[PDB]
Amino acid sequence: MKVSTKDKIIESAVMLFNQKGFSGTSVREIAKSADVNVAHISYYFKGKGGLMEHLVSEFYEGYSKTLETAASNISTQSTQEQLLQLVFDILSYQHNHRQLTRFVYREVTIDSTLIREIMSTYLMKEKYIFQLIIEEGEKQREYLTLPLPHFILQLKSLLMMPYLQPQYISEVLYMQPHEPYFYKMYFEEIKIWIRSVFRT
Amino acid sequence: MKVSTKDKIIESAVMLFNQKGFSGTSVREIAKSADVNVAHISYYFKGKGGLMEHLVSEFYEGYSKTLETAASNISTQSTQEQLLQLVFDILSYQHNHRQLTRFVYREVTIDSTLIREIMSTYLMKEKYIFQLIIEEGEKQREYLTLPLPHFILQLKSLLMMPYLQPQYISEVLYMQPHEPYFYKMYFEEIKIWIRSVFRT
């Protein structure tokens, strides 16, 4: 029904952290845009850094939920249709949090013990799930034509492009540079790519 | 010999725009770090936005110089060793301006008529040079196994990774996440990639 004061603060911090930078916005502007007293921010978050760490911690835990539920489907089906489901889920998760996603990938500062540690956690988990998926892929004659870290780097870099230089994506779907990003359309393009690096 | 006052200002703006954001730093902090009066900044650059546009205009014109001198070698040799030279030049240019490069690719704001127009220029030039290189590539039985916008998107996204999530690059060279970025090492990895999307 009604949005909690803590949620109002978060919603507002995402929107301004994404517009100006982290160092660009202040607790005061965040409060005024959330129509709450400044005291609420310090009470729930300690301050700007702590508000950032909450936003970054939230993003990566939502991201690794998609990873974990791909681990919980290693049975269901073939490992390439497995992988396509996980790519689809990330493209969708990225878009559903697009303001948060853009900020997390671009924010110029970041680095903050806690954040260096949130990131390390997600990367070890991401690495591990992709071996599992690729391992049971070899309990069937579906094999990567790439080492695993090579595959992950090209995947991760393609997944980030919508939030950095989307125009190149517009160009491959339209030979035009300024069409809006539709992630379901992009998925088709990544799928073709994924298919081209499996051999039977 | 001695660094010009205008250069002192630029050097300082690059270093702080890269540390905090654009909206994070002020003309006052830029002046103090350059040991020049604030008046010099307004005189040469109008202000923070105008200083940014100078830094972004400089980055892309240095980038398209590497593109233009690859156009001026369509004669010299084979189009894949052509392409490898251009990739090498960009990796090197990116690193030689690494503080500038990181800021240009990550800065959360940007967009400013002028900048929307600097970007459009470079992208049309980049697109055009890559057709030339790939066209004379077909006056010899060296062909892309990818459409041209697909090739450019994957190349451009691999070229940007050192300034966004370098750890994935460390992992492919070392199976370790925190080694320093050596662009000459990365070039070898992109070269293998480039080779895998040409057919004879």
Author numbering:
A (entry chain A), B (entry chain A): 1 to 200
Task: Copy text verbatim from the article accompanying this structure deposition.
RefZ-His6 was purified and crystallized, and the structure was solved using single-wavelength anomalous dispersion (SAD) phasing at a resolution of 2.6 Å. RefZ crystallized as a homodimer with one molecule in the asymmetric unit of a P41212 crystal lattice. Each RefZ subunit is composed of 10 α-helices connected by loops and turns. Similar to other structurally characterized TetR family proteins, α1, α2, and α3 comprise the DNA-binding helix-turn-helix (HTH) domain and α4 to α10 comprise the regulatory domain. There are two major regions for dimerization contacts. Helices α7, α8, α9, and α10 form regulatory domain contacts with α7′, α8′, α9′, and α10′; α8, α10, α8′, and α10′ form a four-helix dimerization motif. A second interface is formed by α6 and α6′ at the junction between the regulatory and DNA-binding domains. Although the crystallization conditions included RBM-containing DNA, we observed no DNA in the crystal structure. In fact, the HTH DNA-binding domain is involved in extensive crystal-packing interactions, likely precluding DNA binding within the crystal lattice. In the RefZ structure (unbound from DNA), there is no obvious ligand binding pocket in the α5-to-α7 regulatory region; therefore, its affinity with DNA is unlikely to be regulated in this manner.
